[model samples]
Each structure stands twice: as structure tokens, then as C-alpha cells.
Target chain A: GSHMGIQETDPLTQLSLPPGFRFYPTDEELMVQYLCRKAAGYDFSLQLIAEIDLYKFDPWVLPNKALFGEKEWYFFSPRDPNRVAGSGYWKATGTDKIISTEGQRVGIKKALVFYIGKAPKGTKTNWIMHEYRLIEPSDDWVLCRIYKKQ
Target chain B: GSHMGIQLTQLSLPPGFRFYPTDEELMVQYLCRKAAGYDFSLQLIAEIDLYKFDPWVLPNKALFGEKEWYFFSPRDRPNRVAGSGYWKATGTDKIISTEGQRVGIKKALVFYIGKAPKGTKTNWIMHEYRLIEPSDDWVLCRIYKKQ
Candidate 1:
């Protein structure tokens, strides 16, 4: 289950869904299928999803740093209390969409936009982030999917 | 500022002021001013010798806000032990800039509940900030409980 460094053996690649698979799982799928399994010590054999300090780099620099993904990048980043980056900051822009399974809330999804300058006057960019946090938290790990709006 | 990670139960924030401030705000508004010798003029934050007291002893001294506290202290070395416990850095330090120029550095730290080398991790998180090039004289810390 621990497909740590083998890129060729990436399980997500083995699925062979379609040309543009998208890999856009639903909220329940993200919480119950992925995050819960990961938290329960299951070794997911997807090598393309990398663990990175997402806030350390600018949004434009993210694609070059990702292991895989063309239109979107998957990263497991630590939940920093102050969501700041090098040149700009990620500001939450919408209400959280709660993810639930079997009538119990399991996760939270928030939309964030990248801003280029100081708060209250920063210029909004094309960069966006869908931040997913488990409801019953542990080490504050957030599964972020970032993409640029064409 | 969204009250995302903060516990709603323990929060007793004032009308206009929020418990959470951005990293830039912490750097420029609090850290930079404190490093430049104007911290005493700001009555909201308390100045303490951080190493002398424990994490549990801080909340009682906070000027305002519940579940979060701010303090200004002098430059100290690596081993920042507090009471029987210590604060350990969790991730890489970030540069805090103002108007495209780097002003300070912010480091995230986690406070353990017990002694080091065998301490138990707790929900307490801290952000320590200092000036970049010229003056590293003072360190400003924002300590809070993550729910």
C-alpha cells in the first residue's frame, strides 16, 4: 500500500478512467474515501499527490513544484493559522461547504483566492484553492487542490 | 479572521477586535513595532521573559481576547524551554514583507505539554516573528489554542 516513490506504479494512473479524468471526487468521497482512509493509517499508493508546504511558495510557482497534475495540483499542506505565502496571501472568500457521511459531518471545504498585496487592498488573482479539512481534526493537515482559472 | 480553526466555545473576543490576525499584521503591526522599541507604548500586548513562564500561565496575563495571547520578549537562543515543557518549531520559517520588501521572519511553533525529548504534543500553537536584517533584538509571539 505504501507506494512512496514509484511514479510509474501510481495507482491513480492504473484506473484508466478517460482522457480528462479530472479526479474531482465529491465531498463525501474526499472525506470518507480518501482522508478517512489516510488518517486510519491506510497506505494510498498514489505517488503523484505530494506533501508540500503550500504556503511557502507563490501560486504561480506551484505547478512547477507539483509531482503531477496538469490543470490542478494536489498537495497535503499543514494548516497554518495565518495563511500567507511569499509574495501574496490566500484569503478565504466563501462559506464553507460541509462534507458529511451517513448524516454526520466529516469534513469542510472552503474556497480561497490568492491576493497579490496587503490585506484590505490586495489585488485578486486567477489562482484559487479548495481547502479540505477533516471535521474531527488531528495534526491539522489540509488537503488542498489549487488551480488557475483560465 | 474567519474564526476557522479557533474554538467557538472558548472565544470571548471584543466587539471590533478579532482573535486572529494575519501573519503580515502580526509582523508589521505587532512584531515590527515591538522590535523598534514601541511595544511598551502598545498596552494591549504584555511583555514577558518567555522562558521564565509556562504556556499554561500565559492566558491569565493576556490583556484582552480569550484562547489567544500576545507577548513581546528579547532575543533568545534555540532551546526555548518553558516550565517543564518547550515550544518546538514545526515548519520552515516565512519571510514577512511590507510593500515588496522583507521586514521580518515568522516561524510556527507547537507547544508540548511536558518536558522535551519526551514531551507530549498539545493543541497550543505559536507564531514567533523577528526583524530581518538589521535588528533581531526582540521577538513577538502570538500564542493560541487550535480547536
Candidate 2:
């Protein structure tokens, strides 16, 4: 689905968007527009982001696995109750973020902690994360935002 | 790109992409790090005048261009009275939190021309970022004109 060069011809006059029309949906947009519907397995939800068992791989290996991620990457994965990574594990750290809409708490996101070594004595790196899902959750599919703190 | 955290050559992203860093990235990496003097010669966002010009002119002052420009400007706010007009905060101030702490405050503003109190609102919008714990420092400005 790498449709290219049509969008540069015009902004909104055509059917397809520009070649580089990347997804910049806000946290609210991501959950409401993507995660909510994706959990229901709507065919339309498979448009941009990829579905992966994100916890299976290391964080550095994720960029190439994603459709496109230069600075920050996005993916939909099953909520990792048995969350383990190739590098280490994403321990729940920091406070969970309340994603609101129109003054209503519609979704939730946790500032997950990623460590590269074994637990307890594990070496904590600069990798950062935010795992998001509906506040009233379902479908096991959650939106994950992965990036480095540095 | 192997210097002291300075990207020697601008790493080009894939075809349809840009230098659009997230709000959290801007706050934690740019604003927080810079305010704490974390490292030297971090040339990601350039220092510019306190957004004292029109939207079109501010881009040239920052760097080349990006439809959106990021600038680390000196704090001279009072509705951010600029050269051509003033920037009025159209949205409420929201605390931008990261790493378990409230780092900064972000507010969306619309540019108005002619004059304030009743300057005609233009298509330009600016997201102003202010550091919370430390002020005695520069505030980051992300300006993009609505097209």
C-alpha cells in the first residue's frame, strides 16, 4: 500500500493522499479512530498501522518492523499480560495517562518502563513507552507508542 | 552523524515524512534537557527572537522551513505580542506530563492580524510550550499556519 506521488499533485483534490501522508493522529485520535474500531476487527482499521506481537521483539528491532517510524513508532498488539521482550521486559512504571475527549475520560495509556537487562539487577536504558487501550477495554488489541526518552 | 549527539548530516526520513517530533519529545528532550544544560551544542531547534513577527516571517527566522517550524525563544509573553500581530491562546493550558512528572504546560494559540482585543483571527496557529519547574529559561514554540 505504498501509494506514491499522487498526493503531491494536489492536497485534497484527489482520491489518494500524498506519497508521504503519514499518520499524525493525536493520542485521542489514535484510540478513538483506530484502537476502538480495531478491537472490533473492523476491516477499515488495517489501513496504516501493522499488527504485531510487539512484546516478542526488542525495541530497536521495531522500527524496521513498523510501516514507518523515524522518531516515534505505533503498533497494535494484544495487551501484554505476559509481557516479555527479547531485550528485557516492559515493567509498568510512572503514572497511567488519562486520555480524555470533550472533558470525558475515554481511553487510558500507561507510561511503560523498558529495561534491557534481567530484572532487579537489570540495566535501565533510555527507551520510553506508552501502552494505550480503551478505558472500558476489549479485543486484546492495544495501541503502543514506542520511542526513546533521550 | 557520530558527533557529540549532534547529527552531522541531516538524516533524511523515508519519502513522505518530516521532522515532526511529538509534544512529549519536544518537552522532555528539547525543553527539559536544554533548561537543565544536559548537553552542549544540541542544534536540533535553533534559538530565535521571541516570535515577534508574522507567521510567514517566523519560519525564515527559525531555519529553512517545515510548514511547521520549531523554535526555542526567549520568554516575553503577555499574549505573545509579535511584530505583525499578537498570538492569542485559544485553548486552555494543559499540563504535559512525562517520566512520572509534570514537565511543562502546552497551549494552542491563534495568530491575529491588525491588532489585539479584536484582531482578525488568521489561519495561523501556534502551540506554545513553557517549562514548569524552571523558568529562568527559554520556552519552545511550535508554529504552523493552518492551510
Candidate 3:
């Protein structure tokens, strides 16, 4: 069921959340609240988030596959050791970030740039991805936040 | 009995390997690598349920290090009770950046040994470090006694 933006009908006063109210969670909130809970074997009933094999598709194709988001998209994807995304590969741009909650290290964030072409000589694109991995040794699933710089 | 920060010789490192790593290094080098399947045999950093014991009890239990000790602690509720005392944040978080991009955050905390909402603050101080994006499940803490 998709109930993203719905309004309650009332003759006297109608109430509804603002249109396009995306769940813009901070890094801490994303890790401890959503990712940690998800890794803890809890089910997320929110239908707006979709799961996809990120490397299997090109960055341009990601928008259509996304369930929501006008400019950005989120997905729960596997941690790919190959780092291959579509015809090109994703290059690590900067150092990975360590996520913590209340003075405890809980996750890791790696930023990458989508390069379109062959490895060792690929052309960089505007596609950017922030990949988050839990500190848990057993958790292989990673949550990716993707967006383009316009 | 005296201050004993981990010795460089005790923990083998490459020549010129800096002992004092920044917040990002601690998280990415140690935390992330450990999570990504690196099995560290030395156990330089140990794991403990930080909330289970009082801050005073931590120094002795630490495997190695002095003045400042590091540990990987399990996640606890933000405002939960801890051993007749609690760890309360004291200052604004400082964001850690690398190459001009924000990478992690560092927060300072103080331990108070008494009932909640009215505990007496002590000389104990802690710096918590974590990534700024894609939050994780664990945190790296550097606990010390402010001289």
C-alpha cells in the first residue's frame, strides 16, 4: 500500500502532511534508528523505501527505479566487493566516515563517484552515492543514499 | 598504578605509523576494518557494555592505555540509566572533516556518579566519535580523567 501523501477529509477542517514530505534523516538517525533497527531483524512497514541491486543498473536508470524522491533516492543494497555499477565502476572519492551513537561507533559511511567508462580511464559523472555499513561484523546489507549534483 | 598509555613497541606498527589517529582514522581504520572482517589478534581495543559499569571502574579494566583509553561499546538508549550514575553530554559536537568534506563528529561527555537529573559531575571526560553519514551501530569512545 502506498499512502505517501494523503489528506484526511473533514468538512470543517481538512488535515494532511505537507506534500513531498521526505524522511530526511541525519546520519545518526539513519544508522541507529533505521539501519540498526533493520539489521536487528525488524521489518520496516514504510512502503516509500525500495530495495534494489544498485550495481546492476546504471545511475541514470536509478531515478525510475526509486519509489520516491524528486532529486535523491535511497535503497537497501548488498555490499558489493567488486564495486561495479552498470557499465562503469564507482570510484571511492574520499575517506570513509565512522558513525556512532552516544559515544559508540555504530556504522561506516563511504562516498563514491560514478564514473562512466572503463576502469583506469573512466569519465567522472555527477552521480554521487553515500554508502553506509553497520559496524556489526555479521551484517552485510548496506543502505545507500544516492543523488545527482545539478 | 601510574599513567600507562599503550606502548608503541607493545602494539607493532609500521615505521612512522602515527599512534594518535584522528576521529576519522579511528572509525575507518579500526572500526570499519574490524566490521569488514578484519580479525585483530592483539585486541588493542576491547569491547564492553559501557553502561554496565561506572566510569571509575573502566580504567583498571582497560586492556592497555593510560590517561586516555579507547573502547568499542554496545549501543544503549540515549538517556538510559547506568550503574547508579549516568554519562551526560557536556558540549556541542565538533564535526571532523577530511579534504574539506565533513566525515565524522566528535562529542564531549562527562560522567556523573549519582541519581539522574541531580548527579554530581566528576573530573571524568570522554570524547565520542562517529561518522556523519550513513550512521552505524557501534561507537568509539576515548575516556579519560581531566587533570
TM-scores of the models, in the order given: 0.43, 0.47, 0.44
By summed lDDT, which 10 consecutive residues of candidate 1 chain A come out lowest?
A13-22
Instruction: Give per-residue CA lDDT, model 3, range B1-147, as digits (tens).
Output: 898898524543212112355566776666666666776646667788787877778888776554678888864434345687788887899988766888667888888888878888889887887665563256778889998
Error in Å for residue A48 of model 1: 4.4
Q: Which scores higher on DockQ, 2 or 3? A: 2
Which 10 consecutive positions of candidate 2 chain B have the poorest summed lDDT?
B8-17
Native-referenced DockQ of model 3 = 0.01
Among all windows of 10 consecutive residues in model 3 chain A, the one with the lowest summed lDDT is A11-20
Q: Model 3, A86-136: lDDT tens per residue?
A: 889888888899988899999999999999888878888999999988886
lDDT of 2 by residue, A33-91 (tens): 67877766654456456889988888888887776556888888887432569968777
lDDT per residue as tens, model 1, A61-113: 99877766668777778765236787888899878898888989888999999
Instruction: Give, for candidate 3 chain B, the lowest lDDT window spanning 10 residues.
Output: B11-20
- Best model per DockQ: 2
Structure candidate 1, residue pairs in collision: none
Interface DockQ of candidate 1:
0.01
Give the runs in model 1 whose Cα sits over 4 Å from its true position.
A1-22, A45-48, A137-139, B1-147
Q: Rank the models by lDDT, top first.
A: 2, 1, 3
